Amino acid sequence: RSVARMDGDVIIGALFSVHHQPPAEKVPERKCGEIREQYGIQRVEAMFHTLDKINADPVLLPNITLGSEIRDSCWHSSVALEQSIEFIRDSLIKPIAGVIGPGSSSVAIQVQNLLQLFDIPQIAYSATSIDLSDKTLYKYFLRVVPSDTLQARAMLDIVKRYNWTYVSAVHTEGNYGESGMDAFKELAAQEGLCIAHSDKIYSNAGEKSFDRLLRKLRERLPKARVVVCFCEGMTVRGLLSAMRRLGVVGEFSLIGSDGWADRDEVIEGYEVEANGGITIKLQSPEVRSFDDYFLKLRLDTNTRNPWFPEFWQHRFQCRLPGHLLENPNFKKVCTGNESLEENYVQDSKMGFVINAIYAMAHGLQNMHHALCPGHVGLCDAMKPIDGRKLLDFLIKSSFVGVSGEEVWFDEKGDAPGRYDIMNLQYTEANRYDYVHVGTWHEGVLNIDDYKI
């Protein structure tokens, strides 16, 4: 299984999802799925870029090149682990100083277990689950994204502003939905709120179960109107379906967690029984520096991304004349000229990534200053680099985000919360779209009442 890699004085490891996960029965032999641009090639190319930017920089790590080892996680604990092994062992015998990723929280956990056995700092960028806050269990983990605790807090803070003294509650099964809700309900009593009805359900349960859900919900009115949905995307979708089936439309005000966010694939077709709701989404600004880089990527200049070729073909559905990385699903030829701009969309979570890395540099920068006073490069004290220590440095590290955000960690490795309040409405144009209306900057709730 191929592996991205750049050389340097201090090597940072990374676990991005280059391909899709292995199908059901392919889990044993560990064969992954088709390549991914979104959660993959872009994540990878990003590393490199960010690394070039840091290394070229004259303030941060002056005379200490930064290198990296990028392995494919395949968004599955099994592969992620397989790789993670190579990481530690190559190390136990140039060694890894730290790891970025993996994406999924369920995974990140698995990875953290295998990583703390060798005292290796793991910074994440999308794994928000509420367990990763228990250091007594996940000591070496830390992320640049708020946990989901801060999700309930912000959703509640929303219900507060609109003086609603009576709501409903629905959540999906799994360590995501359960933890979040329980978290909210906890904020219910203490704050002074009453929960009319409440239920749960998997995202795959039959349409029947859904209808049943709607029923139990409707029966509680005209009091239980506001439905707090710490729900996975597909669960909300399934609810709207339940309304379209029962021919009823607009009987509640939805308020969903980020599982819903602004995902266009959750309301397609039901842009009606949905309209009006409010979604909480992780506030992650765009990033220009990265487009100017990526888009101008050529097929013969990208020599560090062993994947690119495979990807380039899948991305443009064409094949290369007798190339070790040729695809059998295409017939035409790649002019090696097609422009990556077409139908281009920047990974929603980019910012976090770049930052997670940058937080990994600063950890070192700050370690150097302390254990190598007067030294220009890496002093004996950091050869090798002590795991446990780099950890402190990391935590007690603070800096300016790549987009201008404030970055730091609490005592558990948790980052400050900062979301966006999305509202799905009919634009003055001619389409139902998610419109940015409010923000959440750490307990401070803002909303342009004139936008809702």
Ligand X SMILES: C[C@@](N)(C(=O)O)c1ccc(C(=O)O)cc1
- Contacts to its own copies by CB under 8 A: 28, 81-82, 85, 88-89, 92, 110, 113-114, 117-118, 384
199 marked as part of a ligand binding site: no
Helix, strand and coil content of the chain, in percent to the nearest 5, comes to 35, 20, 45
200 marked as part of a ligand binding site: no
Q: Does the N-terminal peptide bond of residue 28 adopt cis geometry, omega within 30 degrees of 0?
A: no
- What separation, in Å, do the N-terminal and C-terminal C-alpha atoms of the chain show? 50
Pick from 278, 200, 214, 219: nearest CA to 244: 214
88 binds, among its own copies, ligand X, none (CB under 5 to 8 A by kind): its own copies
176 touches ligand X by CB under 6 A: yes
147 touches ligand X by CB under 6 A: no
Pick from 357, 389, 441: nearest CA to 47: 357
Nearer to ligand X, 127 or 422 (CB): 127
39 marked as part of a ligand binding site: yes
Q: How far is the CB of 114 from its own copies (least distance, A)?
A: 5
Nearer to ligand X, 36 or 362 (CB): 36
CA distance 274 to 155: 18
126 binds, among its own copies, ligand X, none (CB under 5 to 8 A by kind): ligand X
Encode 141-178: b = buried (16+ Cβ within 10 Å), e = exposed.
Answer: bbbbbbbbbbbbbbbbbbbeeeeeeebbbbbbeeebbe
CA distance 46 to 354: 7
Q: How far is the CB of 78 from its own copies (least distance, A)?
A: 9
439 binds, among its own copies, ligand X, none (CB under 5 to 8 A by kind): none
Dihedral over alpha carbons 57, 63, 64, 67 (to 10 degrees): 50
32 touches ligand X by CB under 6 A: no
Phi-psi region of 417 (alpha: psi -120 to 50; beta: other; left: phi over 0): beta
In whole angstroms, how far apart are CA 405 and each of 58, 129, 226, 236? 21, 22, 33, 31
Quick note: the x/- pattern for ligand X over 95-124, rule CB under 6 A, is: --------xxxx------------------
127 marked as part of a ligand binding site: yes
149 touches ligand X by CB under 6 A: no
164 binds, among ligand X, its own copies, none (CB under 5 to 8 A by kind): none
Q: Please tell me what DSSP assigns to residue 39.
A: I
Q: How far is the CB of 370 from ligand X (least distance, A)?
A: 33
Nearer to ligand X, 65 or 106 (CB): 106
Q: How far is the CB of 87 from its own copies (least distance, A)?
A: 11
CA distance 420 to 440: 6
CA distance 45 to 326: 21
281 marked as part of a ligand binding site: no
Nearer to ligand X, 20 or 139 (CB): 20
126 touches ligand X by CB under 6 A: yes
349 marked as part of a ligand binding site: yes
Q: How far is the CB of 103 from ligand X (least distance, A)?
A: 6
365 touches ligand X by CB under 6 A: no
In whole angstroms, how far apart are CA 245 and each of 214, 236, 252, 271? 10, 14, 16, 14
127 touches ligand X by CB under 6 A: yes
92 binds, among its own copies, ligand X, none (CB under 5 to 8 A by kind): its own copies
Nearer to its own copies, 87 or 294 (CB): 87
Interface with ligand X (CB under 6 A), residue from 42, 50, 77, 129: 129
103 binds, among ligand X, its own copies, none (CB under 5 to 8 A by kind): ligand X
Instruction: Count other Cβ atoms within 10 Å, centred on residue 190.
Output: 9
Helix or strand holding residue 12 (H, E):
strand 10-16
207: Cβ contacts below 8 Å, ≥ 6 apart: 238, 241, 242, 245
Nearer to ligand X, 319 or 349 (CB): 349
Site residues (CB under 6 A) for ligand X, limited to 316-355 = 349
Tokens of 17: 């999802």
Residues 365/350, Cβ–Cβ less than 8 Å: no
127 binds, among ligand X, its own copies, none (CB under 5 to 8 A by kind): ligand X
Annotated binding site for L-glutamate: 39, 105, 126-128, 176, 258, 349
> Annotated binding site: which residue ranges?
39, 105, 126-128, 176, 258, 349
Task: Give the residues lining the site for ligand X (CB under 6 A).
Answer: 103-106, 126-129, 176, 349
